[PDB]
Symmetry: D2
Subunit: 454 residues, 4 copies
């Protein structure tokens, strides 16, 4: 009914590897040698045209031909009654099922080297316990395992359960057709069990209810796995979420921002300081009007460094007047595992408006920041950075001398707020190298120093 785990011992570059699985699996990384071995590992266990030729000297670990090779596959058998496929793996097998309440099933493969003839044999056994495993009946060249499974292999560079193995279906396909392939794989019910390997981010636009395996750049002994499943909510904005995350899954360091105003400034600063930041990992990700939980959990389970920078903000509850909600603190606290805060009510006379209103709100926000220093201390530990009022004010504290030479006028922080995009473009046009060097080193913009590396 469902795959559960796979254990590989002493096979090529695998020393002792334990990987969790599910019905739909997607593997990626920067190894390109372990990815092509993870599929031969599965083919030597469930395929016939490749098991006839036994192991050779190279197929072991680093040419130490005195150790065993074990491969074990674990399957969960719970729907004893309503499952259509559980009957087939309970009718062909009739003696390894000691009890009618086993709920687990195993398949194993062992190999021991024969020095005299330069040949390594393959022996297959299954059972329902780790201690009592019995051999597969079968006469001639056909085992009893081949009567249950059928394996199909797809590679463009050249009444049974069907298992698909696709390798790199993007060699000579246009960008449009990759989306069609993704839709077919992840939506229609033609495919149920498969494993997939890819280097392009256009195959993962409709990913849902699957498992993701990431391979680190180091020795193959490390592989990480996570279960991806979107919620019932966040269902009206699924396309944007997947389009944002599909490219960040291929990185090593990712920074989360709010809007396109910060993208221009950060791109200019990085270009002036060091231009080769996207070659050595690195990425900039836009979140928008959504909480950070979905990105953070997915990135943390796969060992991806994550950096978050945000600003304090206030919203007015609909209907009621004079009552405000703390959104910036709530979004940062919801990630550490805590509860929302009570609303704060503030009073402003009707006559006061404009900059007088803005300064009152800024003073209130500064007081709120003053009250919760201990929380900010714990926020900064887990790569969460919070500003006092906004980004523009922190910018004014680093390049303020050069701010009053382009806009002239007065109070340039107020001048930017009128139009965020055009005036930021004007500001970035008229900036020297010294200004970017000064921005890159100030404390309030420390987050960038963690994107480039230690």
């Amino acid at each position: 009914m469902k795959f559960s785990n796979i254990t590989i011992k002493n096979f090529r570059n695998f020393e002792k590897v334990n990987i969790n699985l599910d019905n739909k699996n997607v593997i990626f990384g920067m190894n390109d040698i372990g990815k092509t071995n993870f599929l031969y590992a599965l083919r030597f266990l469930l395929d016939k045209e490749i098991r006839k030729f036994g192991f050779n000297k190279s197929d072991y670990h680093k040419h130490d031909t005195s150790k065993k090779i074990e491969i074990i596959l674990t399957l969960d058998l719970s729907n004893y009654e309503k499952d259509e496929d559980t009957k087939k793996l309970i009718s062909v097998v009739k003696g390894a099922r000691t009890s009618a309440n086993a709920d687990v099933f195993y398949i194993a493969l062992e190999s021991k080297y024969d020095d005299k003839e330069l040949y390594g044999n393959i022996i297959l056994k299954w059972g329902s316990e780790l201690d009592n495993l019995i051999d597969i009946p079968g006469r001639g060249n056909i085992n009893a395992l081949d009567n249950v499974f059928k394996v199909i292999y797809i590679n463009p560079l050249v009444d049974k359960i069907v298992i698909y193995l696709i390798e790199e279906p993007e060699i000579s396909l246009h960008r449009s057709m990759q989306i069609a392939l993704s839709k077919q794989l992840f939506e229609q019910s033609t495919y149920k069990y498969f494993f997939l390997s890819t280097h392009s981010p256009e195959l993962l636009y409709e990913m849902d209810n699957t498992r993701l395996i990431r391979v680190h750049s180091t020795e193959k002994v490390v592989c990480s796995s996570h279960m991806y499943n979107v919620e019932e909510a966040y269902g009206s904005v699924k396309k944007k979420l997947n389009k944002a995350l599909s490219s960040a899954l291929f990185a090593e360091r990712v920074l989360l921002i709010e809007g396109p105003s910060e993208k221009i400034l950060f791109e200019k600063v990085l270009d002036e300081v060091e231009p080769e930041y996207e070659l050595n990992g690195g990425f900039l990700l836009e979140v928008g009007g959504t909480y950070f939980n979905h990105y953070v959990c997915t990135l943390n389970d796969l060992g991806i460094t994550h950096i978050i920078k945000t600003d304090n903000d206030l919203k007015s509850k609909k209907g009621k007047k004079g009552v405000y909600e703390l959104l910036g603190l709530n979004r940062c606290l919801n990630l550490l595992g805590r509860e929302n805060l009570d609303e704060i009510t503030i009073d402003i006379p009707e006559d006061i408006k404009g900059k007088k209103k803005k300064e009152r709100l800024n003073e209130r926000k500064k007081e709120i920041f003053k009250q919760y220093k201990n929380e900010v201390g714990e926020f900064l530990g887990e790569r969460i950075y919070l500003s006092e009022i906004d980004l523009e004010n922190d910018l004014y504290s680093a390049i303020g001398e050069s701010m009053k030479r382009i806009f002239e006028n007065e109070d340039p922080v107020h001048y930017l707020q009128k139009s965020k995009l055009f005036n930021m473009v004007e500001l970035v046009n008229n900036l020297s190298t010294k200004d970017c060097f000064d921005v890159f080193e100030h404390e309030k913009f420390a987050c960038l120093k963690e994107l480039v590396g230690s």
Copy 2:
């Protein structure tokens, strides 16, 4: 010194094709046969390891084995004294240069079929005029053309000028390394002459001073070419321009927007109306705070349908108070080839502020719109759409009944203005199929009827 043109007559699927070129050339599209044929055609003229083997029956047009196969290459010879490479193509050639003031040079290739032996000979001829072409001297198996050029071929599926040919350098490369390859090709001087074929948009992140050739989906007889050159005024925003345009170059129809507020709404509307829009062409492009000339010229020269929807706007000139400029109207006139309009000065008493100020500005904008009916009528012809105030007011005229059931409050158009992102997310969460179909059919949103198709 510089390539200028290439003419192909009766070679495979080419009937009569005339393509402009330059030193750096990039070819792309959806017709995969035509690109391979183009690069083979370029090899029967400058490489000896492929010209030994003459033409066969298939190498002609649709097996009409009675027509000539002619290929002519055109080169411009202007730097008669300063170029270090013109001397080489004036030293080896000594008779075709009738006058020391030619400024143009040709290379030609002709072939006629020999029925008796089933073979097609290849005859080579250069000259400096189209009427007087002489034969190339050479004894044995080596021509005089091979003493000037050397051709190098790269394909991962396997004292002289050097010409590089690259075919699909992304078959098994990670995402990071494609950027490094793009940098090396487009910045360093190791490569000076090359032709490239690609399907991935990450190779075109540093493109500058090149020619782009697009191949349509129809018969190969159609191919379009354009010269890409970024100005010195749009510097420091180059890295974002290229990342925006590199994906749009692979489409057949593109819509231009302003910010991320419109992306969410349009994605939801399209998802409810018809979910397969990015497969049959289709793309959404973000512009930001920049004029539309750079995108529009590039997209028009290559035969890509372009759609523009923008809103009216005003700005306050720095320093002077009470004077405003017409940015939205101006940005739609530079594209038609006209001059900027004169500033408009308006007066508002100091006491009046807030919503009363906003209604005064809206009345002024409506009055401005009331005087330029002919301009808007001419704008709409070239696929440019203008709204009276902004997108939200246009939205209120179609789904107004459902606006006052989520936010409640009053005058929800003002409510959205407080926070563009969060409130639009809340709006899109609470919407039904009927609401989206009502947006898709209204007149004031006619733009979406051209991105879907005809």
Copy 3:
């Protein structure tokens, strides 16, 4: 210890074939396809690098994919205590040996088709009886049969018993190398079990103690076998016998003569009548001073037509004077399975000599011939022809009119008798087409009419 028989049922072009064998076997004939299939038949039974791949549609009979394929090999197990290899085939097997006093052993191979998967399975079984055959134990990919035998394949165009299979070892070898190879195979003890296929007669110059298999030109249903073993009496003339018979084994019709005088005449007559007699089978073989048993038995066991023509002769027993022995008559009788006749004593006065003695001997020979008409008539039935005196007399009775025009003189038969080679050369020089046609039709030379054809 010794192979005994092999039975093939429904394999390619074999319908029901039963072939006797021995330790050393040599296969030849005109049908190359059958000689190639006869070795795959053994490889599918004793080799594992070819048995992994099961049967296909073609490997059956004429695409009737509903019949069994049975292959049985029979081995004789008698040297229970003296043989050093009977132990290895009595220790590995421990349950199929029902009694310790059994002589024969069997190895069988069966296959039944599986229509659903398009694959035929191979099942192996031995036993010491034809009614009770058990399955061979083995786990994984290794049977118990592979622990006893090892098969080696040799083809220039590319503690266990060893079986060699040699195919066409004369592709690019010189003549002396062929003779050396023949010596190595048939003399030294390095090779003990092998099967050999050949098209050249130089490998068979010292064949001794072997089994010869001949393949007819018709359907494979016919194959003939004979055990070749030379006697100890014919040990001083072994080389000449083998060199004479090694070329005749590749024919379909063979004629036996006495010496080189009977070769020139027959070659001239055949050349004048029809010059294509060696393409369509045919051969002339010289015997000399031996008996005909050795050639006749070997040729008759392999289905080769044999023709014998001889002349009556008398020779004197050493020591005793006046006593003569019947040689030709006894040599013809020894082939039908009878006993030698008694000596005949004749008296001649000392004075009588010269031609008178010759005419007396001729009269005596004529009387001896007249005594045995029934014996001559029984000789003629089994392709044995006997002349009254000699070939010269029959040639005279055929062409005397032309014989008395070259030698002139008188009694030309005597003139031939003085010197045989030179006078026969002179005679054959001066002959016409009419004379040769006259020789070919006379009754006394009927033997030639049987060599050419029916």
Copy 4:
């Protein structure tokens, strides 16, 4: 009209090789590398599909890439008016014929290395003199030479003049079909120009009017050639002449005998002395009733050692009585280039007959031998051996002690004469090793010590 010679310089293993030729040529020997190179040498000069690819480092001599490669072919042009092929080679070429009375034509090929590009160019040049050679006109990829000749290559291991090149047509052919191929090659007029390479003696069963080329076992610098053309006076013994020389052409040491009586003795003697006499060359050849000139000239031109042993003999002239001729002495004098001797007349009374007649003739032969000692002295220099009476008498002088222990009786030399074959086969049976060692060393049998080697 006729090929005449070929000169190869500095090509592979050829240093300076000069070979004569004709229309039909057959090449053989032991050096299997030179035989292939001799046929690639004729394809770089006349074949288009192999000359496109230039020389490499290996195609030179022992990797010394600073010397020229020249190939010249010589063709005789005499039938200026009657030949239907001389017109073609005088019409296509129209400027190299300085005079209409040249009678000789040349074709040449030169090549000089180009170190920079690692390539060797091929330049072609014909002419009717060795001093004035002009270049061959032609534009593109087709020369003027390709309009006259066409080349065909045959190898089973895979209005123009046609040249065939056959390589080893005996790989998988039956013995009967080789004769069929020989008849077509050497009789019918379909083939006129060809070269042939072979290892089997059955292809040369009808050779007439050809050239034979033999390659020695040493370095390729040695190659011998001869013209084979049978006379019209040997036309009735042709089918037998070529069935004995064909096998001898593959040897290095050949001995000539008269009949099978000597074969029986010599085979046993050699078997007892040393059995591996046929691996290291060596062969016995029967001549019969013909002169030795035809064999001796053919074997001498090809550098084959020849040994001749003959016995004295007398014959009676037809018609006349009492007059005798000296056949044996004349057959040895004819080969040294002399004239036949006069007849000798001897008288014998009618009464004397039988053994007395034989002893009178033996005394006469002994006197004749005594007369001509000087001639025998010169005969023995050129490997011609003569005996006084016969082989039997010389045998009696070496093993006489053992002669009178098998036949007993008396005068065993007379006893053998009555029936040579049946008594020699009995003598050979009853002979010990010491008896055979005593024939191999005696002076009268010095011929056997030169066959085995020095």
